[PDB]
Amino acid sequence: DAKTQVEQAHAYNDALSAGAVLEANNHVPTGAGSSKDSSLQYANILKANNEGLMARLKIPSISLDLPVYHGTADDTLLKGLGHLEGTSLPVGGEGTRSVITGHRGLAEATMFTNLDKVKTGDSLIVEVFGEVLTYRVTSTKVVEPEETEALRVEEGKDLLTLVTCTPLGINTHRILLTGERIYPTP
Ligand SMILES: [Cl-]
Ligand SMILES: [Cl-]
């Protein structure tokens, strides 16, 4: 059912027009995608356990290794990183953009506090249902509270986008970065 869950994820990504927006003065990114097939149920795809675990994300340059969950509810984001519903599931594919968010500034956990230390050329590594996908960081950006940033699919690229979030009512700059799929020798 790992084989199948990954095939289901690709089918979901095929039906989805991925998109997101970082809204002005919003503490979390906003999902902004649509699906040509709503029978592919998000919660049930890449469902590794009953708590909604999807994947793990590693960023060796900042010693990060965290669980990735379905969705970006408040409680989820205190357990780990949230996948932003409306964006591609993190199984790759041409014309995909997967968005994952996590807190900065907490005392109780690091989460994405050191995301600003990530630089172009660094690896982002997704471990998902037994597969390992590597992305190389190609852009980093500070998005100030007053700015709005659309996150759209780019051509036939296979993109992973990470963005910081905060608790509700904490209005501060976001760190946004994107990596593109690469293929290290196995
Ligand atoms: Cl593809
Ligand atoms: Cl805290």
Side-chain angles (χ1 to χ4, degrees):
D1 205 1
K3 175 199 202 299
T4 310
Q5 283 250 41
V6 174
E7 294 164 70
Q8 281 199 262
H10 284 308
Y12 176 93
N13 277 1
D14 286 347
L16 183 83
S17 301
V21 185
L22 280 40
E23 296 174 346
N25 305 303
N26 191 347
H27 69 110
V28 280
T30 307
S34 51
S35 182
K36 289 185 300 225
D37 184 359
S38 66
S39 82
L40 294 166
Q41 300 192 248
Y42 177 66
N44 289 335
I45 295 170
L46 296 182
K47 193 182 194 203
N49 60 23
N50 286 342
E51 298 74 60
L53 182 72
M54 179 183 296
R56 300 195 69 77
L57 176 72
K58 301 168 49 173
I59 313 172
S61 69
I62 55 165
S63 302
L64 181 148
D65 183 336
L66 291 169
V68 177
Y69 289 87
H70 286 77
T72 48
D74 285 345
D75 58 349
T76 306
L77 292 175
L78 300 184
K79 290 155 81 199
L81 305 174
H83 173 261
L84 178 66
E85 191 183 356
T87 73
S88 316
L89 294 179
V91 295
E94 286 176 355
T96 65
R97 187 167 198 159
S98 185
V99 178
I100 296 174
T101 194
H103 282 301
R104 59 174 276 111
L106 304 187
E108 74 181 35
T110 299
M111 299 301 194
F112 275 170
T113 283
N114 296 129
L115 199 70
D116 55 357
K117 305 304 169 36
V118 183
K119 306 164 334 184
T120 73
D122 289 348
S123 294
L124 321 172
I125 302 162
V126 175
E127 298 167 312
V128 54
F129 279 72
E131 307 199 319
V132 182
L133 290 77
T134 306
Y135 292 80
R136 188 153 55 210
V137 175
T138 55
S139 84
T140 78
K141 186 172 187 154
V142 172
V143 183
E144 292 298 344
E146 70 274 17
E147 309 182 91
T148 307
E149 176 103 11
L151 294 176
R152 306 170 197 287
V153 168
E154 295 175 19
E155 285 115 339
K157 299 189 204 208
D158 178 349
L159 304 177
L160 176 69
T161 297
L162 308 187
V163 61
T164 60
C165 62
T166 56
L168 177 72
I170 302 298
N171 207 20
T172 180
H173 69 267
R174 293 153 286 190
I175 305 308
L176 174 70
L177 64 82
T178 291
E180 181 161 9
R181 186 76 171 286
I182 60 162
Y183 293 100
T185 309

